[PDB]
Structures are given as C-alpha cells and as structure tokens.
C-alpha cells in the first residue's frame, strides 16, 4: 500500500458521502451525538414472562384493520 502501519484514512474516504448525509440528517433532526444518561435502563414489558406471544407489527395491524 505504501504505508507501514494501519490507517483509518481509506475507510473515512470510503464512507464520505454516507457520512456527510448522516451528519446533515442528524443536524436537521436536532439529535445529540453520543449517549449521555449512561445509567439508563429500559423498563420490563408489562407482564413480561408470559406476555411474549403477542403480535405488535404495524403492517400486520394495518392489514387486520383493513
């Protein structure tokens, strides 16, 4: 390749347009990069141990309603 050790430059140059699009989309959406509130844990689903076999798919719901 012409370089001794590893480098992230070819990878960064590879994903340049998708990185630019992601940056612009994140700026538009008003998001915060990274994860503050690191000690956040999601709650258990209501009636978790025996409530797993319940369909919660949007496409299935729309098809059933129609």
């Amino acid at each position: 390749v012409g370089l001794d050790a590893l480098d992230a430059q070819p990878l960064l140059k590879y994903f340049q347009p998708v990185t630019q699009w992601l940056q612009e989309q994140n700026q538009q959406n008003g998001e915060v990069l990274g994860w503050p509130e690191y000690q956040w844990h999601p709650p258990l689903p209501d009636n978790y141990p025996e409530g797993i076999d319940l369909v919660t798919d949007e496409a299935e719901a729309s098809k059933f309603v129609e």
């Binding site: 990274g34 503050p36 509130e37 690191y38 000690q39």
Partner: protein, 558 residues
C-alpha cells in the same frame, strides 16, 4: 531584580556545581520572602498581607522560571549523562518549568483558569427551595449536616445539592485546564501531566505496583464494607440499602465517603464498655494549652530526637488566635526557613485528637529539622508520601493507651481484648475506608489527563471507578451533564492525591520496622517507641536524607 537574574555557568562539572551554589544563594532568599508572605496570610489579618502573598508568589515565580530557562538552555547533556544523585536531582528540579513553557497569553489564561476553579469551588453554596436568607456552605454547615443528620432525605438533599452546585459550573474550566496543562507539560518533556505527577515517585512500574498493592489490601476493605453495609441495612431499612449491592455514597461519614468515622456511632463492636476517649484527666493534671507541645518535645528528646531550637517558644504560636482575625483552623506547619528555624501554626483544644495532631505536626517539624544540611532543591523528603508517613508513624505510636498510661495521661493501661477491638475498628474506619479513595481519585485524574477520558466521559468513568474500587452507588441518577469529580477539593485545586494513599500504606510499614527494631515482638497496637534510643537513632538515620537518594533505597535501608 539583579538577584533574580541568572549569572554565567559553563557546561563543565565545576560549572554545574557553580550553578547549584548560585541557586542556593538566590533561592534561599526567594523562598524566605515567599514563605514570610505565606505566613502573612492568616485569613487576612490586615487584608493586605494577602496581596503581599500574591506579589511574593509572583516574585518567586519569575525567579524560578528565569533559573529554569537558563538551565534548559545550558544544561541538557549534564542532565543526560552525569551520574551522582545530588546534581541530577538539582538539575532535574531546575529543568522543569511547569507552566512557564507557555506563551504570555496562554499562561495568563492558565493562571486565570486556576484562580477561577479555586474560587468557584470556594464560594459554592446550597440553598433550600424556599430561598431562605441563609444558604449552606461546605464548611461548617454541609459537612456537619452530612456527618450528623441520620435522615435519608436530608442527607440526600445535602449531598446532591452540594455535588450539583460545585460540579456543574466546573466542567468547561476543567476541560480547558486539562488542555493547557497537557500542552505545558508536553513541552516540558513528559508525555502528559499525569506522567509528570507519576515521575515524582521514580518508578516505571508505579501503576502495576499500586494495583498489586491494592489487590493485597482488598479482603480487609471487603469485610469492613460488608459489616458496615449490614449495620446500615439494619439502621435505614431494606428499601434504601441492598444487602448484596453497594451502599449509597451519602449514608456514611463525609460527603465524599472517604472516611467512615461518623458511622462509628452505630457500628460499635462492644458498646457495653466505654471507649478510651477522655479529656477530664488532661485538665485534672493541669496541662497548659501549650504544654502539650512541650510534652511532645520532651517525648522526642527522650529517644534523643528533635533538638528543638528556642525560637519556636518565642516566634511560633501554638494556641488559638487570641487577637486578630488569624487562621481559624488548618493542618499546616509553615517553616521560617532562614536556613535556621521553623514554626508550628495550629489550633489548641482539650481533646485527644488535638494532642495527636500536635504530635503529628511536631513530627513534621522534626522532618524539617533533619535535612537542613542538604541543598535547597533537596528539601522535599524523597517520596512525597514520606512526610505524611514519618509524621503519622509517631502519632500511631502516641495514640496507644499504653503510651498515655506511661506518660501520665491515663491512670492505668486498659488491657482488654474488647477494648483493643473497639480501638482497632475505630481507627480502621478512616485508615482503611480511605484506601480505595486516593487510588480511585488519582486513577480517574490520570485517565482524564492521558486522553482515555474525553470531556464526554467524566461522570461515567468517575462512577465506574467509584463502584469498582470504593463500591458506592449514586443515590440520584447522574449523567454527563453533572461533574461529580469537581465536588472533591483536590480536583479543582490542582494537587496530586495518591500521596495520601502511599503514605497510609507506608506509615504501617515504618511502624512495623521500628517495632521489630525496638525489640518488642508482640501485638502491634500497644507498640509505642518510648524510651528506645536505638529506634530513635535508626529513624534519625533514615530521616537524614531528604530526596538525596531515591526513595526505594531509603526504604530498603529502613
């Protein structure tokens, strides 16, 4: 000032010796003025002696940076090659400019940031929701409230309020300070500021040795933590304390959970017999408010130690301030220097704690006394923890009941296993509970400096270390907005904190070595070093060399 301007020196060995002698001849006076103006700051006795300290500190800073610039521009290969210890020590000490390597604007910003951080820590207040005309400060309101009130809600309110108030406005200043310090000490020659701080200990394997040392001390802290957690679970119930998980970092001792002394109220092993905490016997014997220092001096003289110069009893105040708004209370012993004399400046009371502190500061003065013959740069005693270790081994030897009985403060020795266990646990709630701390704090600061902790991972790494080593969970859910490391006093005021851990480890080693040397091969509690001239001679021999040789060699000697 022509005295503050370096002269001429050559690259020859005689030239380096001339540099060392000239540094003596100038820095002696410079440190005289600095320490005199330092004494002048007794809580603004006249409100102008403070600005005299500020001007003398600037006066010393300019001279130090000038001498260091001369040494850098003239003494690189001498630092690289010459081999005897004293000149290498002198040249290494003069070579490090510290914050003097930055440009004028950057250095001014650095000093302004340091003063900013110190001030914003000092004047941080906690106010109740009703916004009463009074607002709590850290001293003496918040600390007393946290060390006295056994109310979960009040303790939590005080803890969270102080941590928020003293940490949230301290984040950007600390980030900029870390950047500036890293730049300055990278220009100095070290890879980082943390590397500079570790370089005082002169050990390539310092971190590995420290980790192994803490791994050796783990079971003691584990048992103590389990016992205190059981007591707290009995007191505060089961909802707020988990018998398996950690304990919240407000329910014990201080605000930062470094010392667990204030828990000893509810965790006593044997409460049937009274503990040895007596002050009436001192007053019945008719002690002075100053004769405690005199009996400490005669105790030193007994084992041929501390030939105290008379200037202390005429120019050193050992009492509370009778007149003038002098110091309220601290734990320092400022030296007159002069190449002649020193001084104690402390508070006097009737409790045994004051007597132990008196013995500790007398030991510090003894440390100052022994290395006077050494050059100016060889004033610090080898390892920066040596000062505390030497000043605390004597206090350990003194606080024993046998010492008090043999020196008249106690009618007779209380030879009971229950009393020994009570005293051992009382002293193990500050000399063991602090052991995970210090190590924890300086590991966090090393990580922050080295770049392993970016400004977006301060609280995360801090609380990971707190739960890992100390093992205390935050009662309130924190996040990256908070800066809980800035609540500690030593984080804004830039001061290393591993010295206390090293000294706590070292004082027991010194105590054991002296006890084995003293010829008393028994339990290590009642092992006072009174009336043992050989132990005094050995301690004097070790105390003679201050930074003259690496601390490892002195430790091997002792």
């Amino acid at each position: 000032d022509p005295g503050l301007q370096p002269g001429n020196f050559s690259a020859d060995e005689a030239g380096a010796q001339l540099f060392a002698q000239s540094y003596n001849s100038s820095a002696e006076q410079v440190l005289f003025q600095s320490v005199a103006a330092s004494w002048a700051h007794d809580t603004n006795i006249t409100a102008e002696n403070a600005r005299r300290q500020e001007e003398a500190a600037l006066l010393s800073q300019e001279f130090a940076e000038a001498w260091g610039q001369k040494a850098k521009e003239l003494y690189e290969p001498i630092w690289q090659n010459f081999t005897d210890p004293q000149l290498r020590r002198i040249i290494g000490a003069v070579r490090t400019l510290g914050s003097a390597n930055l440009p004028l604007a950057k250095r001014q910003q650095y000093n302004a940031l340091l003063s900013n951080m110190s001030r914003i820590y000092s004047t941080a207040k906690v106010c109740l929701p009703n916004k009463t005309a009074t607002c709590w400060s850290l001293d003496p309101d918040l600390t007393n409230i946290l060390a006295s009130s056994r109310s979960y809600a009040m303790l939590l309110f005080a803890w969270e309020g102080w941590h928020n108030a003293a940490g949230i406005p301290l984040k950007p200043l600390y980030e900029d300070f870390t950047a500036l310090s890293n730049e300055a000490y990278k220009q100095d020659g070290f890879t980082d500021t943390g590397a500079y701080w570790r370089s005082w200990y002169n050990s390539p394997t310092f971190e590995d040795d420290l980790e192994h040392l803490y791994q050796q001390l783990e079971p003691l802290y584990l048992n103590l933590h389990a016992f205190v957690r059981r007591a707290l679970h009995r007191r505060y119930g089961d909802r707020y304390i988990n018998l398996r998980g950690p304990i919240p970092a407000h329910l014990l001792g201080d605000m930062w959970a470094q010392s667990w002394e204030n828990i000893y109220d509810m965790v006593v092993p044997f409460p049937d017999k009274p503990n040895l905490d007596v002050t009436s016997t001192m007053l019945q014997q008719g002690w002075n408010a100053t004769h405690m220092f005199r009996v400490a001096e005669e105790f030193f003289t007994s084992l041929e130690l501390s030939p105290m110069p008379p200037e202390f009893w005429e120019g050193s105040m050992l009492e509370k301030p009778a007149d003038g708004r002098e110091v309220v209370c601290h734990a320092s012993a400022w030296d007159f220097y002069n190449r002649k004399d020193f001084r104690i400046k402390q508070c006097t009371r009737v409790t045994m704690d004051q007597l132990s502190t008196v013995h500790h500061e007398m030991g510090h003065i003894q440390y100052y006394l022994q290395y006077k013959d050494l050059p100016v740069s060889l004033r610090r005693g080898a390892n920066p923890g040596f000062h505390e270790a030497i000043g605390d081994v004597l206090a350990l030897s003194v606080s024993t009941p046998e010492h008090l009985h043999k020196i008249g403060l106690l009618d007779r020795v209380t030879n009971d296993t229950e009393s020994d266990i009570n005293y051992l646990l009382k002293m193990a709630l500050e000399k063991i509970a602090f052991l995970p701390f210090g190590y924890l704090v300086d590991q966090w600061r090393w990580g922050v400096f080295s770049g392993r902790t970016p400004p977006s991972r301060y609280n995360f790494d801090w609380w990971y270390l707190r739960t890992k080593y100390q093992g205390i969970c935050p009662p309130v859910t924190r996040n990256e907005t908070h800066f809980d490391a800035g609540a500690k006093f030593h984080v804004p005021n830039v001061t290393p904190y591993i010295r206390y851990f090293v000294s706590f480890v070292l004082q027991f080693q010194f105590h054991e070595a002296l006890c084995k040397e003293a010829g008393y091969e028994g339990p290590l509690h009642q092992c006072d070093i009174y009336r043992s001239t050989k132990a005094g001679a050995k301690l004097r021999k070790v105390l003679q060399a201050g930074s003259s040789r690496p601390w490892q060699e002195v430790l091997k000697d002792m």
